[PDB]
């Protein structure tokens, strides 16, 4: 975004800089271990309230 | 870029008054500054009068002058408005250029005193882009 | 980086009046400073002057000064603003430079007297970025 | 850390005048202090002046001081402020420094009375953090 | 805990005038305090002065003081504030030390006059702590 | 329990003044109280002085006193606050001691006028507590 002005004119050069700059890093983990013991012809059970 | 300014003299009130061989007195028995103003023509920059140089001095009519090495003065910083109008603008600034109501008007007046026989002035001094400036104000009295 | 600062110097009323053989008594029988005003030039940093110089000083004529080993003063701290405008600008403060708003404008004058011939100072000081400075205001007369 | 804190001496009126072998009578016949301001320049750590040293005392040119041995004055307490600018700032106080809104500005104006040749002056004390500091003031004028 | 205060002596009009051999008559025919400001550095405890030694007395430079057995002073209460700022500081007091908002600063100046040669006295007192404490401030004049 | 009070006694403007051969007349022809101040240091009781003893009287260095027989006063009903800080404190009262916003400060200050050579005075009376105090304020002078 440049622009001129014909009516003033500034004195020498200026620069006026910014800078910026990031970095990350991010690791979740989630475990589950679960047993049941059962039967073979195991049924469902119906209670439910 | 263009720069335009002129000048209203006045140079009324400028002479001491002595030659009264009367007097204040019982009877006429014991007792025996100019004012500059620049403004900026429409359409002109901004511009700041840094001295003037007196090309030519003549006392009752004598060229006591020699204008090969004029009178130089160093002594004025004196800022002449750019000549328009706009909304923002201040007492003595100059507007921006881009307010996009700005019209071309006459600048604020601005004044300066020389308290002083004809001289031949010539101011000088650098515009709002850094360029050198002359205008010359030939014919004051006194 | 660049420093552009003016100074409208006003040397009236600097010499004092003595030469009078005639006197403010019945009838001629019985009775026988300069305002310095520094302001910065748009686009340029403040600046704080520490003192002078006086680099050839003449009385009628003579050069009485040696400018060998000049006359310094070291009794100065004048701080000349910045020469821009913006919105949180105080009375004798200089804006930051980064307003969004800050435009290039003559700085806030800021004066000196010195209290008095024809000598040629020479200010002294340093910049906002801590460099050397010079300006010269010869030519000031009593 | 720095420190970097200048004064303006403003040696007028302070010298008794004397010299007057006329007189404010009928017609001859018979009747026959210096303000230092101190002020710290941006970036600048706050200080307290302690006291200061004559190194060099001269009467009409006569070196009568024996810088062996200066002359000591150790009955001064001025805090002069750090030379930043922040909103919590009261009168006579210096900013912590992590203002978020601080910014490097001259330091509040203190001054100091020495009523009163030319002798040069040494002004010493320490910084906010406790470290010795030394102020040469030469030139002062009677 | 460490105990820092700094006095301001200003010794100026403390001595009588009287070398007028000639008078405020006709024609020259017929007629033939000290305020001490004590403020503490930022990070002190209070004190409390209790009184005072004279340690050096000499008029005109004769020692006539006899430093085996100084004159002593116990009539004095004047209390220095700490040393810090806070919210709920009144005007004479001091703050607790844990406002969560306290910060270091110099304290509210107290005042004392001794009307009184060269003399070096010595202030003593006791810190908050109820530890004891002296403070030299040789060098005041009549 | 403890009890710690300090006094302040200055006392100038306490001799009267008659040493004067000369005189206020034509020329020389013709015409040929201390204050003291009380207050309790922080985490003191309350106390009430009832008197005081002179312990000491010397005019010009002669001991006519008697330490046998001392001169003893009990005229004197002075309350001396207790040297805390609080809410609901009047102007001459004590706190109670236990408002959960209880400080440890300087008490009110109080006075008394004796109206006087150099005596050594030793006031007395009981604390909050009801037990037996004194207080020696030697040294005072005329």
Redesign the interface.
């Known amino acids: 975004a440049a622009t001129f002005?014909?009516?003033?004119?500034?004195?020498?050069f200026?620069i006026?800089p910014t800078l910026t700059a990031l970095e990350t890093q991010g690791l979740t983990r989630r475990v589950y271990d679960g047993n049941v013991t059962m039967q073979s012809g195991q049924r469902s059970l119906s209670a439910t309230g | 870029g263009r720069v335009n300014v002129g000048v209203d003299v006045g140079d009324a009130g400028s002479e001491q008054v002595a030659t009264l061989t009367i007097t204040p007195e019982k009877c006429d028995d014991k007792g025996v500054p100019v004012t500059f103003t620049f403004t900026a023509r429409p359409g002109s920059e901004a511009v700041t009068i840094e001295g003037y140089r007196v090309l030519s001095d003549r006392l009752d009519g004598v060229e006591r002058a020699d204008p090969k090495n004029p009178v130089e003065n160093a002594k004025m910083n004196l800022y002449v408005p750019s000549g328009y109008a706009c909304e923002g603008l201040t007492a003595g600034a100059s507007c921006q250029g881009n307010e996009s109501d700005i019209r071309i008007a006459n600048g604020q007046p601005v004044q300066h005193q020389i308290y002083f026989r004809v001289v031949d002035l010539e101011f000088y001094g650098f515009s709002a882009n850094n360029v050198p400036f002359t205008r010359k104000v030939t014919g004051i009295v006194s």
Do not use: R
Not at chain 1, 5 to 12: D, E, M, R, V
């Open positions: 002005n014909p009516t003033q004119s500034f004195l020498g200026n006026f």
